[PDB]
C-alpha cells in the first residue's frame, strides 16, 4: 500500500533539493533516515522531515509495520516562485527569483 507525505512551497530550489532526494531513492526508510542525518545540506533536513512524516502516516493511518517500508517514489517539483528586486549599480534593477519546490515522498511496504 502506498502512502504520501508532501511538503509544498518549501524554500529551496527544486534543483538543490533534488541532490538529496536522489540519495535516498530506493532504500528502506531506516537506512535512508541515517543517510539523511549525516548528509550536510539544508535540503537534507527538509527531506528528513517529510520522510519521517511519511512513516507516521503509513503506520498510524494504514497500519504498516515500519521495518518493511521502502522509499518507492520521491520527487521534487517546481513551486510558485516569487519575484523580488535587487538594486544594481548605475541604477538598473534586478527581478530576483526566490524559488520554492514541492517535496513529495511516497513509501510502500511492497
Amino acid at each position: 500500500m502506498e502512502t504520501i507525505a508532501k511538503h509544498r512551497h518549501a524554500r529551496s530550489s527544486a534543483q538543490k533539493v533534488r541532490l538529496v532526494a536522489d540519495l535516498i531513492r530506493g532504500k528502506k526508510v531506516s537506512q535512508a533516515l541515517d543517510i539523511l542525518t549525516y548528509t550536510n545540506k539544508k535540503a537534507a533536513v527538509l527531506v528528513k522531515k517529510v520522510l519521517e512524516s511519511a512513516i507516521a502516516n503509513a503506520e498510524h493511518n494504514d497500519g504498516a509495520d515500519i521495518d518493511d517500508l521502502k522509499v518507492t517514489k520521491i520527487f521534487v517539483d517546481e513551486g510558485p516562485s516569487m519575484k523580488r528586486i535587487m538594486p544594481r549599480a548605475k541604477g538598473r534593477a534586478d527581478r530576483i527569483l526566490k524559488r520554492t519546490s514541492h517535496i513529495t515522498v511516497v513509501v510502500s511496504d511492497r
Partner: protein, 56 residues
C-alpha cells in the same frame, strides 16, 4: 563574453552529471552505547570508542 546560442537542456544535463553527492556508506556503531555515528566522530551522547568522554 556571453553565450551565442541558448544551450539545450541536454548540455545542461551533462554538466550536472558530476554534481551528485556521495552518500556516506558506513555508519560506525559504538560498542558501549550502540548508537550509530561517524567514523572518528563522537556520538550524540558524547560516547567515543566506548568512553563517555563528554558529560553531555
Amino acid at each position: 563574453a556571453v553565450q551565442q546560442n541558448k544551450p539545450t537542456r541536454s548540455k545542461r544535463g551533462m554538466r550536472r552529471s558530476h554534481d551528485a553527492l556521495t552518500a556516506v556508506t558506513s555508519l560506525s556503531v559504538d560498542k558501549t552505547s550502540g548508537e550509530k555515528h561517524l567514523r572518528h566522530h563522537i556520538t550524540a551522547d558524547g560516547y567515543y570508542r566506548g568512553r563517555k568522554v563528554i558529560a553531555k
